């Protein structure tokens, strides 16, 4: 239920590691991490998990407070805003692909991540994004949990 | 010179792996190769960096298709998107910085990070950017080239 949503960002936090978008995945963990500490029932499992993840980040960090883009670690504001450019981007495109692309299960996963990433800017930085901004970002949530939904019933398939 | 710039960007690239992100160091590795490559009659040393570099640039293609967002290394328009976002996120920083923030080394590496990457976006996808996009990315590498040049004379730092 719960530590399935956080073990398919942490899958997808590791995907983005592995393609060198080491803050794209940074940041997706730290999300992890406090979508795990928000659960008052943990389980054994998962706090094994809290703790991998905050090596990892806490290592992540060390290695970068090369010293080009800190910025975007220690800016919480200018991270805030490049994970919404990238994200966004990568939404857009999707839309699109929904429209005339193909219908596999790549679409499938590119709408979670989204979802995903999504969801990690707006956990994160709350008191940090517009109102206004907030429920655009919820909406673009919704409309890729909908399309979801529309490809396992082969509706648009 | 030639030989300067490659190993200048070889460098940067470097740098960029150990912060996470790869896929900028990735699109530096296929300038430098380019620009190694530009010289026909080019020193051993660099040729075998030429080399070097393919063996890396080739690497990397085999560990990746992550399987979501492989989309950057084979295509030249997203690519481009994903490169000039960060890029003119990092040049907007460093032109508020040379305003009021501190004039140190990093000002500097920080400008000529900037050139590079304005310059490997022009080099890799000159046959994609609109003709009024060039004169724009020019015009900025030609600025931070300049301030450069106060920052010498101390007219700025």
Redesign the interface.
């Known amino acids: 239920s719960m530590a399935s949503n956080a073990a398919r960002v942490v899958a997808?936090a590791?995907?983005?590691?592995?393609?060198?978008?080491?803050?794209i995945?940074?940041y997706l963990q730290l999300y992890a991490v406090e979508l795990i500490l928000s659960e008052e029932d943990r389980s054994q499992e998962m706090t094994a998990l809290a703790t991998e993840l905050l090596d990892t980040i806490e290592a992540?960090k060390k290695?970068?407070g090369?010293?080009?883009?800190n910025?975007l670690i220690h800016d919480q504001e200018?991270a805030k805003?490049?994970m919404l450019?990238?994200t966004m981007?990568?939404y857009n495109?999707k839309l699109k692909q929904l429209k005339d692309g193909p219908w596999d299960v790549?679409l499938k996963?590119?709408l979670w991540?989204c979802i995903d990433l999504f969801s990690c800017i707006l956990h994160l930085w709350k008191e940090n994004i517009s109102e206004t901004s907030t429920n655009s970002l919820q909406k673009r949530i919704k409309y890729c949990k909908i399309y979801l939904s529309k490809l396992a019933k082969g509706e648009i398939g």
């Open positions: 997808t590791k995907d983005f590691d592995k393609v060198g978008l080491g803050i995945g940074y992540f290695e970068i090369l010293h080009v883009m910025t200018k805003i490049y450019n990238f981007s990568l495109e790549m996963r590119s991540c």
